[PDB]
Enzyme design. Structure first.
Site, PDB file in Angstrom:
ATOM      1  CG  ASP A 297      -3.096   4.971  -1.885  1.00 27.32           C
ATOM      2  OD1 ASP A 297      -2.151   5.643  -2.347  1.00 27.32           O
ATOM      3  OD2 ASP A 297      -3.958   4.420  -2.603  1.00 27.32           O
TER       4      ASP A 297
ATOM      5  CG  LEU B 168      -2.131   0.905   1.418  1.00 23.82           C
ATOM      6  CD1 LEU B 168      -1.730   2.350   1.510  1.00 23.82           C
ATOM      7  CD2 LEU B 168      -3.094   0.744   0.258  1.00 23.82           C
ATOM      8  CG  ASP B 169       2.021   5.194  -2.767  1.00 24.92           C
ATOM      9  OD1 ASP B 169       3.077   5.354  -2.120  1.00 24.92           O
ATOM     10  OD2 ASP B 169       1.600   6.028  -3.595  1.00 24.92           O
ATOM     11  CB  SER B 170       3.618   6.354   1.908  1.00 25.68           C
ATOM     12  OG  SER B 170       3.597   7.766   2.015  1.00 25.68           O
TER      13      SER B 170
END
Ligand SMILES: CCCCCCCCCCCCCCCCCC(=O)OC[C@H](COP(=O)([O-])OCC[N+](C)(C)C)OC(=O)CCCCCCCCCCCCCCCCC
Ligand SMILES: CCCCCCCCCCCCCCCCCC(=O)OC[C@H](COP(=O)([O-])OCC[N+](C)(C)C)OC(=O)CCCCCCCCCCCCCCCCC
Ligand SMILES: CCCCCCCCCCCCCCCCCC(=O)OC[C@H](COP(=O)(O)OCCN)OC(=O)CCCCCCCCCCCCCCCCC
Ligand SMILES: CCCCCCCCCCCCCCCCCC(=O)O[C@@H](COC(=O)CCCCCCCCCCCCCCC)COP(=O)(O)OC[C@H](O)CO
Ligand SMILES: CCCCCCCCCCC[C@H](O)CC(=O)SCCNC(=O)CCNC(=O)[C@H](O)C(C)(C)COP(=O)(O)O
Lengths: 606, 86, 63, 57, 64, 172, 99, 459, 173
Positions: free
Chosen positions: B44, B40-42
């Site tokens: 997001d 999960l991209d930071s």
């Protein structure tokens, strides 16, 4: 000498008992709220008997009890005057606060200082029916600050909330600006009419009360939160919900309007004064409503909706309609008080959230609260044959049917349309929609305390004006021949305002993005008043106090002109006297001068 | 309001990450660090904490919002902020 | 604070209640004097020109 | 009961009370010199009663 | 304590009479005082003028 | 300390969406506009010119400072919210409870006994936890306000009392 | 060490020596007795009877005697029909105004 | 007359010869007893003042102040037995000796029948207060403070001495009755103004009016608790008593020369109350508030109107009782925090709940909230001033508006708000402080029922 | 009655006879009825008990009377012995005149509620009586100063016919 005069006064001595019992501290530290609620109930029940005696006969009392003290030609005495404006107000006022008390225990069921809270409400109450019941101007001035200081403590109920103190400080400030006008009227009446009892003022027919009435008008504007002195009332929602439900909804905020109704006979003699009465009411109606339809807190919506009403009340007293304005006090006491704990019901149930953007779909979730609100909003809009119709529809017809300022009349119509506008906003966002609150739902209204309290005013608000209008003697002049086009205006504007406000509201449902309109940037920010008038004048006076005043004068100049200059001069000439050489040659030389000058120069010898 | 206790928090917590379609339900662990294993991209991450914010109704300061990093640590910071001890 | 508050309700009422009955007792025993005219051949006492008994007694004993 | 000591430590308490009863004495002595117009002002001067000889002391 | 000192005592020792300080002192000093004097003087100079020639009404004004 | 660019963007992303929520109000609009708002964010993710990234965030918040809702949505407990320190007036420091009269203290024996343990614990722990502080304090005073934990076993982390014994957020 | 002085003494708490301390003085028995004096000779004998004394004080400023005279005087005056209170006070008939 | 004086001075041997630890007790006993006897003097006849002898007399103005001073006397003893406990018995006895010697002078001057006799102990009150401020004062700048307070009053009092003896050589005796009956119209000759200035400036100084007021903030703050109350609750009021007495032979010169003082006072109250709005020191804030209330009386007395005198006597007492209480509030807070800055100890209500109340009616009383005696004072004065001129209500009412802001400002900053974390020595309030506070407030509301007692001879 | 009807003229009360026609019961009759046998009679029962006890041991008091004494217009210059009697007599008459205005003020205020909506014209007699009193009161004591004395009252008065006789001379022409 009927029981009327005797038992109209005991009603006051009924509800002061809980105050005395509390000071004993033997008072029940647990079921105290029930004790006061039942006490106010009996005070209400007693209060009908003077009422029922009234519309039958029509006798209004003036009782002059214990003589306080006499001032040469002045005889300041504790005297209660049971006018129709009074003998009616105690029944409704206790009826509302009794219901508020029933709602109060449910809402504030966890506040540890609840016994103190109920004590404050009663103390506020006592200050009220000594304000309305005031045969002399002095004890009228007693309530005019007794309620104000009581509001300050109640508003700052949560002492730690820094904003609550600021709002509490704000309330007493704006009130005191109005209070300035009050004592100005007191000074004029005592100096010219040589009294403060309302009887002598009327009989001395001061038909040119230019300064007095201006003082009275200024007093009303501060208390009733008019233009220039409004923003304290919207900012007074930082207090707990019942606190705003009772004081700043229909009981204490309307006191300023009640002042003019007391002094109506002198106001009608003048012509100039009633102009800015309806002028101030006109601007107050528009501006408060204009900011109302853009706020996002139910307390903010309702409070502004009040100030628009008190804007409307003064419009009627403008063109010689005092009692219809007093009639509007009656109805506003019922439905406006409702909208608060009706809103308070959703607030407490939906985890103390006051942002109108988080409800939606509450119609089925809280059917009774939703049912209560729609009747209240319809009453406020002035739906025929229920509460607001008996006053507002008459008022809008009344001011229209008179020689008034054309600009003033126009704003009343726009305000009435705007009155419906924010009513739709509340019903739309809060109820007609989809849930937006946090996931865990705790919606509940099944508590009998909330149900009984709301229902008690519901049956009151449904009929309301029917009973009062049919019971009171026909004591205003009824206009008869309206050209039907403007007699429908009482309903056209609100129905018109209903239409687009609904269309504007569900335009939010439309997927199109809402660009920020500059008018919205103006209306939503309380009409720009708090941003400026609460930052510019406060900074200047405060900066003047420290930079100038204290530092410049008290600590620099006033200490330098008289004290330091003399101290410097003494020291500057103490040193040179004491700075001697110790050589007799100079001392004896000084003596030779002294002998020479004294003998000859100053003519001492001749 | 009944006492909200840490077992209910994690139940509501993992309810939302499992809800997040970017994190399909199968590999949710209590201490599943987002970008380390879930990917999960930071960007997001500064988005899942407002989902938590509305989930429990309160604001998470940014000083620790960037530090709120694991579902167990999500629960841990929730408990003390509302003195949840049971 | 509780003990201190109890002290007023003790000490103030310590003299409050005996005075409370005393004020009422003189109002249920000898009552209030009536405005009688000046009788002939008898100048009244200095304290006599008062209607309330306590005021008369205060005038009699002190002033 | 310890009276040799309650007197020593509490003999001060009688000082002011006798001072008051003393204060009345000079108050009721100084007025005698101020007799002068006793029952002489025509506002209050009146016929002297059979037994008492001084209207106001 | 530094703030209290700087705002209570450390003013006059650091004060220096300058035209800015001097004019502001005069402007905020005698200025308002004389201004109110003129306002009250002329108001009283109109009030006694009216009553002296009987151009004012105090029919019911007794408790002055 | 260093408010590096990525945190500023996250500051921009978080607060703007909250404002955007205050605008759309309706959930479907909020969800719809968030994705496009999200979409226009991550699309420009390839910039070796960090200065250009800064230039892209010149007009960014200026539009926000125009586009900001004049009444943003805040949960009441947060600063500005309606329930901000509403229950502060109730919470009272624990040390005031030491003043309590013995009869009052007798009303709660075992809890007061538990207080004695806490008073005992904080006494020797203070010297231990303070001793850990100087022996590991960085030179030239503390460089960062963050406080190091208890390195060894048994000892409590330094300056733990006020944080641990802080009054609960809902005191009544 | 500047001067051979003593460190600033710490404010003792009267409560921790005796929990029932009333703050009047250190020694408990006189402290309890000071309570009795300050209240008995405070609230009790001064506020209660002093209020009743001043409240029941005899006619002060002749506030009621003037009323009774006024009632009789006004009853005399309108009975004869002459104005109920003359605009003049010292009868001008005697006054010997210069020229 | 004597029934108050000898009991007061005979109290002095008691304190000196009492037991080592009973000094506070027996002094408090008979100080309250003296108060009871003084209350017996409160009675007044219709128009003739209660005259006792050539040396002493009382009127409807002197009596309320007399009972106030005797009523005060127990309060300093109550308020002082906390910061003087750790003192040698002789110094404690000396401290008590100063108070009753001071209080003895107050009975003398208020009952004085001759202006010179009124004058001799008019400054004689300074010597005990100078000792109290200097020796037992707890500060550093008290030394300069005592000098400022001493020299200011002397600088104004000495012209009165030359003026007063001039009256004696020109108009025979200076007996208050003989002046009032033989009053003559003071001329407008340019000497009579300096005549007028000398007879007035002495009472001006110890009734701080704008400009001649810088001693008061330095007088009150550095003075100990007992010194602050006596100085603010009676000492600022000898000037008041003098004006009601001495303005008998200053008319019609008072009509024309009143203008510079009236403008100075009316504008000064707005300025001084503005200082209260931004005072860093709690004691200083209360001190400056006394200037504003006192400056209101300056306009009250100097208008020379029946109503104005009445409201003056109402504010005469009510301010004194209130200012003493507020100084007690500051003192009762000071030693706990050992500082005078207001923001040092915030949120005290959550810690001390009863003091929250005591501070609350105290602030309300200073607010002139009706029907408190302060309101009767201010409201009566406004009407008298308004009759004098219509404009003054703009200044008058503005003061009440400012008086509201700063009065609750101390309430919010100290009582309400968040408690200070660092402080941990705030103990539960001793019931002595609580008892004393009710000793102040309770007679104030008790006075509300009977304003006629304190309205004065004009009533 | 305790007070005098001549001092306080009370016009006779016009109380209409109750002649209702609606069949449904008039409630206010009932609330007055229950009040009569719940409050009024027990109050009267206690009252007759206290009043008979009062008459059991009756003590009297009279009203002090000050005889006429030479006032300030015939008192010699200086001579404070005669000034004392003069000043006290004048101040006593000041008290009576203040009460005279008070009595008239109550009568004027009594009209207001008594005449109701007829107040404007019904008691114009009450208005002029107060107007006559207040104007005459102004000529007597008004603007005398807070240190008012019988000397000043004579002084202010002596100006009155000074101007009046001067006006009379001008009027005669
Ligand atoms: C008939 C009698 C019924 C009972 C009356 C009991 C008393 C009462 O309530 O009277 C009401 C009366 C009301 O008067 P009234 O005109 O109504 O007549 C009374 C009789 N009734 C009620 C039946 C009509 O008022 C007073 O008596 C005034 C009371 C004033 C009390 C003042 C107390 C002062 C205490 C000071 C203490 C401190 C001293 C030192 C400091 C001084 C200041 C600096
Ligand atoms: C049932 C309840 C009844 C309540 C009644 C009302 C409250 C009564 C309260 C009484 C105490 C408060 C009043 C104290 C008066 C002090 C004395 C005074 O005024 O002057 C001294 C007075 C008057 O001074 P004198 O004696 O020189 O006066 C001469 C004139 N004769 C003699 C007529 C009085 O002293 C005396 O009368 C001497 C006897 C002892 C007095 C003791 C007084 C204090 C104790 C009571
Ligand atoms: C003659 C008879 C005339 C009758 C006129 C009746 C008008 C009724 C009101 C219509 C306009 C106001 C309205 O519709 O308000 C509701 C609504 C609120 O919109 P907003 O606050 O922006 O919230 C959006 C959330 N997504 O939608 C809005 O658009 C709010 C708009 C705010 C500004 C409204 C300004 C109205 C000015 C009226 C005239 C004032 C005097 C000139
Ligand atoms: C710090 C400075 C003082 C502070 C402010 C104090 C008040 C200001 C004025 C002070 C006046 C002090 C002197 C007044 C004494 C009594 C005055 C009096 O009774 O009136 C006389 C007024 O006469 C005077 O001359 C009085 C003095 C006038 C002022 C000049 C001296 C005083 C000012 C300077 C000294 C004090 C200032 C401080 C100096 C360091 C009447 O006499 P007469 O002149 O009418 O006599 C008859 C005939 O005409 C000839 O005598
Ligand atoms: C309603 C709308 C109102 C208006 C709302 C605002 C809309 C307009 C502004 C939109 C953003 C602007 O164009 C450019 C900018 O500030 S930044 C671009 C991405 N580049 C960086 O920030 C540096 C390198 N990249 C990283 O630092 C990480 O990639 C990051 C933290 C971004 C993602 O998280 P992780 O991955 O670390």
């Amino acid at each position: 000498m009927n029981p009327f005069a005797s038992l109209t006064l005991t009603t006051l001595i009924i509800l002061t008992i809980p105050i005395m019992m509390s000071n004993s501290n033997i008072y029940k530290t647990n079921l105290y709220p029930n004790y006061v609620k039942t006490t106010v109930s009996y005070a209400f029940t007693l209060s009908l008997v003077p009422l029922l005696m009234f519309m039958h006969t029509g006798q209004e009392m003036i009782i002059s009890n214990w003589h306080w003290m006499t001032l040469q030609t002045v005889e300041l005495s504790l005297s209660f005057k049971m006018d129709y404006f009074s003998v009616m107000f105690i029944p409704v006022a206790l009826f509302v606060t009794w219901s508020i008390m029933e709602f109060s225990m449910w809402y504030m069921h966890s506040d540890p200082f609840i016994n103190r809270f109920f004590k404050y409400l009663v103390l506020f109450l006592i200050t009220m029916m000594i304000l309305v019941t005031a045969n002399n101007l002095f004890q009228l001035f007693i309530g005019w600050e007794g309620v104000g200081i009581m509001s300050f403590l109640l508003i700052g109920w949560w002492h730690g909330r820094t904003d609550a103190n600021t709002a509490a400080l704000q309330a007493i400030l704006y009130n005191r600006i109005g209070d300035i006008g009050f004592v100005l009227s007191m000074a004029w009446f005592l100096t010219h009419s040589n009294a403060w009892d309302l009887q002598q003022i009327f009989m001395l027919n001061n038909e040119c009360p230019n300064m007095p009435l201006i003082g009275l008008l200024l007093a009303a504007a501060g208390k009733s939160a008019q233009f220039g002195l409004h923003p304290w009332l919207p900012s007074a929602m930082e207090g707990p919900t019942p606190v705003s439900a009772l004081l700043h909804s229909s009981t204490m905020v309307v006191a300023g309007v009640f002042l003019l109704i007391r002094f109506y006979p002198l106001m009608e003699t003048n012509k100039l004064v009633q102009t800015m009465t309806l002028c101030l009411g006109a601007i107050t109606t528009l501006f408060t409503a204009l900011c109302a339809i853009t706020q996002n807190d139910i307390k903010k919506i309702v409070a502004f909706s009040t100030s628009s009403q008190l804007g409307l009340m003064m419009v009627t007293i403008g063109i010689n309609q005092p009692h219809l304005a007093f009639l509007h006090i009656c109805m506003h006491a019922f439905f406006k008080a409702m909208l608060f704990m009706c809103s308070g019901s959703i607030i407490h149930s939906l985890n103390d959230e006051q942002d109108i953007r988080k409800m939606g779909g509450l119609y089925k979730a809280m059917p009774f609260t939703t049912t209560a609100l729609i009747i209240g909003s319809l009453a406020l809009t002035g739906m025929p044959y229920l509460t607001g119709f008996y006053s507002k529809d008459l008022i809008i017809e009344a001011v229209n049917m008179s020689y008034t300022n054309a600009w003033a009349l126009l704003m009343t119509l726009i305000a009435t349309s705007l009155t419906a506008a924010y009513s739709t906003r509340i019903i739309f966002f809060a109820f007609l929609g989809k849930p937006r609150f946090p996931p865990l739902v705790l919606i509940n209204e099944n508590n009998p305390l909330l149900i009984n309290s709301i229902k008690r005013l519901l049956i009151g608000s449904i009929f309301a004006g029917f009973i009062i209008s049919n019971n009171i003697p026909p004591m205003t002049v009824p206009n008869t021949t309206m050209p039907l086009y403007m007699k429908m205006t009482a309903l056209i504007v609100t129905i018109m305002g209903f239409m687009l406000a609904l269309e504007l509201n569900n335009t939010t449902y439309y997927l199109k993005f809402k660009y920020p309109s500059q008018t919205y940037k103006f209306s939503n920010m309380l009409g720009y008043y708090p941003s400026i008038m609460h930052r510019l004048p406060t900074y200047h006076n405060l900066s003047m106090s420290q930079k100038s005043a204290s530092s410049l004068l008290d600590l620099i100049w006033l200490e330098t002109i008289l004290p330091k200059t003399t101290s410097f001069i003494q020291m500057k000439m103490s040193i040179m006297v004491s700075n001697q050489k110790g050589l007799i040659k100079l001392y004896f030389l000084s003596f030779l001068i002294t002998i020479m000058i004294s003998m000859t120069l100053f003519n001492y010898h001749e | 309001a009944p006492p909200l206790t840490l077992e209910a928090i994690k139940d509501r917590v993992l309810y939302v990450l499992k809800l997040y379609d970017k994190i399909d339900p199968e590999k949710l662990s209590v201490n599943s660090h987002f970008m380390k294993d879930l990917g999960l991209d930071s960007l997001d991450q500064v988005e899942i904490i407002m989902a938590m914010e509305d989930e429990f109704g309160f604001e998470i300061p940014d000083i620790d919002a960037e530090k709120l990093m694991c579902p167990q640590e999500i629960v841990d910071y929730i408990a003390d902020k509302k003195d949840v001890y049971e | 604070d509780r003990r201190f508050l109890k002290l007023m309700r003790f000490y103030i009422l310590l003299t409050g209640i005996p005075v409370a009955i005393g004020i009422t007792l003189v109002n249920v025993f000898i009552g209030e004097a009536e405005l009688a005219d000046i009788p002939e051949g008898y100048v009244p006492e200095h304290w006599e020109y008062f209607k309330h008994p306590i005021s008369r007694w205060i005038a009699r004993t002190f002033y | 009961m310890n009276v040799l000591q309650i007197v020593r430590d509490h003999w001060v308490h009688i000082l002011v009370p006798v001072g008051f009863v003393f204060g009345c004495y000079l108050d009721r002595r100084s007025d005698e010199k101020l007799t002068a117009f006793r029952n002489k002002s025509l506002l209050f001067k009146r016929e002297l009663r059979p037994n008492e000889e001084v209207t106001w002391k | 304590i530094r703030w209290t000192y700087a705002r209570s005592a450390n003013i006059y020792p650091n004060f220096r009479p300058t035209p800015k300080t001097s004019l502001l002192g005069a402007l905020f000093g005698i200025g308002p005082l004389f201004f109110w004097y003129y306002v009250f003087k002329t108001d009283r100079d109109k009030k006694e003028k009216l009553i002296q020639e009987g151009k004012l009404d105090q029919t019911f004004n007794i408790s002055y | 300390a260093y408010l590096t660019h990525q945190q500023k963007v996250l500051r921009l992303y978080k607060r703007a969406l909250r404002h955007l929520e205050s605008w759309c109000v309706h959930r479907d609009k909020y969800r719809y506009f968030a994705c496009l708002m999200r979409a226009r964010f991550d699309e420009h993710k390839n910039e070796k010119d960090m200065v250009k990234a800064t230039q892209l965030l010149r007009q960014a918040e200026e539009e926000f400072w125009y586009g900001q809702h004049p009444q943003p949505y805040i949960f009441p407990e947060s600063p500005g919210g309606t329930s901000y320190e509403r229950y502060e007036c109730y919470k009272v420091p624990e040390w005031c409870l030491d003043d309590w009269h013995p009869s009052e203290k007798a009303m709660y024996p075992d809890y007061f006994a538990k207080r004695e343990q806490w008073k005992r614990l904080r006494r020797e722990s203070w010297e231990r936890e303070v001793k850990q502080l100087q022996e590991e304090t960085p030179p030239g005073g503390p460089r960062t306000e963050a406080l190091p934990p208890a390195r060894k076993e048994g000892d409590l982390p330094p300056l733990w009392w006020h944080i641990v014994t802080r009054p609960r957020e809902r005191p009544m | 060490i500047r001067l051979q002085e003593d460190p600033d003494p710490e404010d003792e708490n009267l409560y921790e020596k005796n929990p029932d301390s009333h703050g009047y003085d250190k020694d408990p028995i006189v402290d309890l007795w000071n309570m009795r004096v300050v209240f008995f000779f405070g609230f009790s004998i001064v506020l209660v009877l002093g209020s009743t004394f001043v409240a029941y004080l005899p006619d002060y400023r002749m506030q009621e005697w003037a009323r009774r005279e006024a009632e009789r005087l006004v009853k005399y005056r309108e009975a004869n029909g002459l104005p109920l209170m003359e605009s003049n006070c010292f009868d001008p008939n005697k006054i010997q105004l210069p020229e | 007359m004597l029934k108050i004086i000898i009991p007061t001075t005979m109290l002095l041997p008691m304190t000196w010869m009492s037991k080592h630890n009973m000094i506070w007790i027996n002094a408090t006993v008979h100080s309250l007893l003296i108060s009871l006897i003084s209350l017996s003097l409160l009675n007044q006849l219709g128009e003739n003042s209660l005259n006792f002898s050539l040396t002493f007399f009382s009127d409807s103005l002197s009596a309320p102040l007399l009972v106030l001073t005797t009523w005060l006397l127990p309060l300093m003893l109550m308020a002082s037995q906390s910061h003087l406990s750790k003192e040698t018995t002789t110094r404690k006895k000396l401290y008590i000796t100063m108070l009753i010697l001071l209080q003895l002078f107050l009975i003398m001057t208020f009952t004085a029948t001759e202006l010179i006799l009124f004058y001799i102990l008019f400054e004689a009150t300074l010597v005990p207060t100078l000792i109290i401020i200097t020796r037992w004062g707890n500060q550093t700048e008290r030394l300069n403070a005592g000098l400022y307070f001493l020299f200011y009053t002397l600088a104004g009092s000495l012209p009165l001495l030359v003026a007063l003896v001039y009256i004696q050589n020109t108009t025979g005796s200076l007996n208050f009755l003989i002046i009032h009956y033989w009053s003559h119209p003071l001329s407008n000759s340019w000497s009579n103004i300096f005549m007028w200035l000398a007879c007035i400036m002495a009472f001006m100084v110890k009734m701080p009016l704008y400009g001649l007021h810088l001693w008061l903030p330095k007088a009150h703050v550095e003075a100990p608790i007992a010194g602050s109350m006596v100085l603010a609750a009676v000492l600022l009021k000898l000037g008041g008593y003098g004006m009601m007495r001495i303005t008998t032979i200053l008319n019609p010169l008072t009509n024309y020369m009143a203008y510079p003082f009236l403008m100075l006072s009316m504008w000064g109250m707005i300025m001084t109350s503005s200082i209260c709005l931004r005072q860093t020191d709690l004691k200083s804030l209360i001190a400056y508030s006394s200037v504003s209330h006192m400056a209101l009386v300056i306009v009250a007395i100097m208008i020379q109107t029946p109503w104005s005198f009445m409201g003056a006597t109402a504010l005469m007492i009510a301010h004194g009782l209130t200012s003493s209480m507020l100084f007690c509030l500051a003192n009762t807070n000071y030693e706990r925090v050992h500082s005078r800055t207001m923001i040092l100890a915030r949120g005290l209500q959550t810690l001390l709940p009863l003091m929250a109340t005591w501070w609350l009616m105290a602030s309300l009383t200073n607010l002139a909230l009706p029907p408190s005696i302060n309101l009767i004072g201010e409201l009566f004065i406004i009407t008298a001033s308004f009759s004098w001129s219509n404009i003054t209500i703009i200044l008058m009412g503005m003061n009440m508006m400012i008086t509201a802001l700063y009065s609750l400002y101390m309430l919010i900053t100290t009582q309400r708000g968040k408690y200070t974390h660092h402080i941990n020595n705030i103990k539960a309030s001793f019931t002595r402080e609580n008892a004393l506070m009710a000793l102040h407030i309770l007679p104030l509301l008790l006075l509300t029922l009977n304003p006629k007692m304190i309205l004065g001879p004009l009533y | 009655d305790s007070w005098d009807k001549d001092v306080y003229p009370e016009p006779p009360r016009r109380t209409p006879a109750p002649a209702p026609q609606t069949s449904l019961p008039n409630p206010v009759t009932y609330l007055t009825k229950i009040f009569d046998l719940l409050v009024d009679r027990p109050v009267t029962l206690a009252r007759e008990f206290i009043e008979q006890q009062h008459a059991k041991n009756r003590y009297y008091y009279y009203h002090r009377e000050f005889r006429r004494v030479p006032d300030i217009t015939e008192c010699e210059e200086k001579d404070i012995l005669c000034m004392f009697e003069a000043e006290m007599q004048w101040r006593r008459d000041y008290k009576v005149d203040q009460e005279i205005v008070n009595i008239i003020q109550e009568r004027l205020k009594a009209c207001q509620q008594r005449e109701g909506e007829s107040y404007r014209q019904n008691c114009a007699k009450e208005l002029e009586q107060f107007t006559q009193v207040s104007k005459a009161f102004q000529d007597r004591y008004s603007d005398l100063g807070a240190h008012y004395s019988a000397r000043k009252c004579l002084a202010k008065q002596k100006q009155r016919m000074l101007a009046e006789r001067k006006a009379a001379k001008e009027a005669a022409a």
